[PDB]
Design a protein around this ligand. Structure first.
Ligand SMILES: [Mg+2]
Ligand SMILES: [Mg+2]
Ligand SMILES: [Mg+2]
Ligand SMILES: [Mg+2]
Ligand SMILES: [Mg+2]
Ligand SMILES: [Mg+2]
Ligand SMILES: [Mg+2]
Ligand SMILES: [Mg+2]
Lengths: 76, 205, 78, 85
RNA sequence: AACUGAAGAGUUUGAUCAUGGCUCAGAUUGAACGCUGGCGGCAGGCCUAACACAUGCAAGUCGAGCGGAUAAAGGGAGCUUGCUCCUGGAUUCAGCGGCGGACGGGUGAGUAAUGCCUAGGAAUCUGCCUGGUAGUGGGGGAUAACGUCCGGAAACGGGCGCUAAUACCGCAUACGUCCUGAGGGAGAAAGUGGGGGAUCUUCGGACCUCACGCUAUCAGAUGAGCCUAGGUCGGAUUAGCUAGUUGGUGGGGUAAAGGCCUACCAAGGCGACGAUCCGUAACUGGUCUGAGAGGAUGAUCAGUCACACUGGAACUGAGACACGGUCCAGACUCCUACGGGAGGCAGCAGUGGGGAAUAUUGGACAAUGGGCGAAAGCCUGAUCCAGCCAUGCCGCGUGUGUGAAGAAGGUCUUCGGAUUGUAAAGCACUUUAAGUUGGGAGGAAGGGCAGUAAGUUAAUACCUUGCUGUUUUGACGUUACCAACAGAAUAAGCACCGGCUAACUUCGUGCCAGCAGCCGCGGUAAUACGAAGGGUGCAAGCGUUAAUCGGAAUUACUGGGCGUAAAGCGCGCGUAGGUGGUUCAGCAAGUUGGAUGUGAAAUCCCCGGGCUCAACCUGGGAACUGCAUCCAAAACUACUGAG
């Protein structure tokens, strides 16, 4: 289990925010829409930029509404 | 619920022989089957298109003696089985016990065979059956109970088997009165006056 | 505790039991862990009275399943 | 009612009063250590820590506090004595 | 084992084609009502006031935990038929304790969310069960009962005096446990019962053995608590919402991660992919229609959640913030000596009330199950069974044959007849169900007692286990089922008949009364109103009303439209978003194929098997369209690199 998204926020302290896109299909009209997903990955070293491409995985909860962490930065 | 009442009058509307009266005396002498019953037995003209399908369904339903709650129950078991619901609807009416007593020839009417079953006088596998709905299988040795083998209702009816012949899927023994249902009938021993393509179409709409 | 006991299915005056393994504080007809056989007292003709499978009964009885009074004999008479 | 619920009613205060004595005694031997930390006392807290470990653990196997709760005070209070060195 | 259906009609007009509404034919319900009414199987029965409740009963059990008081048989003596006392003691239960009342039964008020489904994972707990491992050493102080005093209308409360335990508390020891930094430090226990070779001794006892119980701990199952991701009704004439609010740090707190809590720090967080707010509603496996796609809907059965007169709150405990527990506040009934008390049928019956509308103050513990004791036994309004109600599905009767002078009798008529009609009558047979009499299984596994053989042992003493022998047990119950007797006797309605639509003529009535699902009939000849004959549909039922889905290609994904029938913004530019010319190369996110884990059981479907058949019950398979993890393929789309 390993996801991938891009960063939109650096405002908080040791906390980053990703967007994970997703193509689900519509159940009756047979068309693939795009619907988003927005998590709070636990940053660890205050070193990611707005516009990166990072990789997350799931741990036990660290604060509330923050259970995902940072694996590694893939590309700028 | 049976049908108790006049019995030429059913044969007199549909306009056929229909084999309801018992003896071989005469059709259209006890009956006078020339006309539609009732007062206005002379006026006729243009049976409706729905009325033709109901007239075919009511004909088959009065040869055998079912009612419609039972008759639609046979129609469900026809559409369950594989292929040719018209033929399957007939072969569930042939395997019924009151028909096979009539085919062996243990009665004059078909309604007489219903009464001989109903008074426990008929056995199927060596044990008593008194239900006029028992679906018999291939190879069931229908025999007559020994307490009533001396009834003249059965003895006289075997001379009424002379105007009938054997239907060539049974065999009857005129000494011990123990018939044997050999196999299922085919779609050649049944008369072509009944139609398997009007009753099926009636139960759609 | 877990236990091996008999359910009850069928009409009036014609029972048909089921060898189930259940947690003890459940209903009769409620939930169960799994089912392993049946028991038909009024079996006649081609019907089979006892139909226990010895594989899962080897498994559960080695882990503290606790049988009933009738099941004390039905596993015995196999 | 029953003559059996009225027995479990009388048998509740005889344990409520009994457990409260065994429960509050634990907390007095813990507040003696914590009030001795705040005055920056190295050997005063060390004496209180010694004669309060047997009081907590003897009240643990009686079944008053749970055994993982007694495992929690002993870890943290050691972490404040090594911070006075 | 794998498996198939799809119908139209009437109505806008002098008439026609089209667009478009409306209405009917179908299958269904926890149904209600009107007319009528023989039977048996299998089912179901407060959908409204979660509105109040008279009276019965629904969770207790252990004397192989310990006091105490009842004291049998019997051992008796004595005295003269009976008492006296004595001796043992079997019973028996108010009290302390161990367990259990957190399971089983009930109801749908609340909640638009992580409640409930599906897929995952990490930070924990778990009495009774199973497998192990190490034990089960000694000691003390109180307490109810019972005494006795005092107070209270009671419901009860208070004091002094006495005794016991597997109650309670120190002390001793301890891994294979906790904390610690290695080093070191800390913590437990309970005994009763059956026997007995030897020996100490009052085999009071020690003693050995067995059964049981208890204390640490690891593992397994079982149950439980948490977190993530997704899906989850209508309203945009609801567009901004939020300061433990959103993160960080330090400290607390809980079995367990966390603003769970607190102190400072920082100014964030969510929102048009619909936040917030309003309105309603318990969800799910499934049921009902449909050819299918879908559409409605969550009665009985099963899983999960939420409540127990209203609002709070914790204790006890393995596990409750607890339906027959505790405390408080309130409302409402009742008691009282006026001081004070008592109670909670959304357990099974039942009453009142509401309403179109919904059942007996039953029978038992025999079965399956639970609780305690394993020693039998004891409790059980959950269960298993009966009673009531055409409330539904499935089955069977209400006779069968012969019989034309074609009888009366009825209705109609061109007056000739036709029709009711072989239908009756007459004649010959038959007796299921109901009635009556006799017979009669299966649901029964055990328990007691006795005997015997195995292994426990120091002792085949006890006890456990095979087996033998003997004895005992059913609410249902007059059982299903079988035989005999009576005699055709015991047993048919309901709507409709102008068109859709199967089936028709006379008589009253005359724009009156009346009919009606739509078209619409009735003004003096009505096949439409009211009757009478006749006839057609269904039957132990038939009709109307209410309510869903079909037909409706009438919200059109499968499957429609926009020149004039309703329907193209007055025209531009443009953000989010949707779609992408052409060559290679890469990649594998879509896509196809396969494997594994899952998708509870039931239900539906297929092949069988049992009840005289069927409904009903039941064995094996398919299916549950899903989601996740792996393996491969590379045409097309996406992404990447070059043109
Ligand atoms: Mg359709
Ligand atoms: Mg009640
Ligand atoms: Mg018996
Ligand atoms: Mg009669
Ligand atoms: Mg009329
Ligand atoms: Mg449609
Ligand atoms: Mg533009
Ligand atoms: Mg299933």
């Amino acid at each position: 289990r390993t996801l991938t998204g891009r960063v939109v926020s650096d405002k908080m302290d040791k906390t980053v925010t990703v967007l994970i896109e997703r193509r689900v299909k519509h159940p009756i009209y047979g068309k693939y829409v795009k619907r988003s997903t927005k998590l709070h990955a636990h940053d660890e070293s205050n070193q990611c930029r707005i516009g990166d491409l990072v990789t997350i995985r799931e741990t036990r909860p660290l604060a509330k509404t923050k259970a995902w962490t940072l694996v590694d930065i893939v590309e700028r | 619920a049976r049908y108790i009442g006049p019995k030429c009058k059913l044969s007199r509307r549909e306009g056929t022989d229909l084999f309801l009266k018992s003896g071989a005396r005469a059709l259209d002498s006890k009956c006078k089957a020339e006309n539609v019953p009732g007062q206005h037995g002379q006026r006729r003209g243009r049976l409706s298109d729905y009325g033709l399908q109901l007239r075919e369904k009511q004909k088959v339903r009065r040869i055998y003696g079912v009612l419609e709650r039972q008759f639609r129950g046979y129609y469900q078991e026809a559409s369950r089985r594989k292929g040719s619901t018209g033929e399957n609807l007939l072969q569930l009416l042939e395997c019924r016990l009151d028909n096979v007593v009539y085919r062996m020839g243990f009665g004059s009417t078909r309604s007489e065979s219903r009464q001989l079953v109903s008074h426990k006088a008929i056995t199927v596998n060596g044990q008593t059956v008194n239900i006029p709905s028992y679906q018999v299988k291939a190879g069931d040795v229908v025999a007559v109970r020994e307490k009533s083998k001396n009834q003249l209702r059965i003895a006289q009816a075997l001379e009424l088997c002379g105007q009938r012949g054997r239907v060539e899927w049974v065999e009857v023994d005129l000494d011990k009165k123990a018939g044997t249902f050999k196999s299922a009938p085919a779609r050649s021993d049944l008369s072509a006056d009944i139609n398997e393509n009007l009753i099926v179409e009636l139960y759609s709409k | 505790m877990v236990t091996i006991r008999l359910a009850r299915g069928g009409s009036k005056k014609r029972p048909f039991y089921h060898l189930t393994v259940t947690n003890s504080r459940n209903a009769r007809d409620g939930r169960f862990v799994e089912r392993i056989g049946f028991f038909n007292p009024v079996a006649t003709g081609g019907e089979v009275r006892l139909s226990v499978d010895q594989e899962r009964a080897t498994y559960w009885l080695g882990q503290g399943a606790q049988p009933s009074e009738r099941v004390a004999q039905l596993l015995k008479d196999a | 009612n029953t003559p059996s619920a009225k027995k479990r009613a009388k048998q509740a205060e005889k344990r409520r009063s009994h457990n409260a004595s065994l429960r509050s005694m634990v907390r007095t031997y813990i507040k003696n250590v914590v009030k001795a930390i705040d005055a920056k006392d190295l050997e005063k807290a060390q004496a209180a820590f010694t004669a309060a470990v047997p009081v907590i653990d003897r009240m643990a196997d009686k079944g008053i506090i749970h055994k993982n709760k007694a495992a929690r005070h002993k870890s943290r209070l050691s972490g404040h004595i090594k911070a006075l060195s």
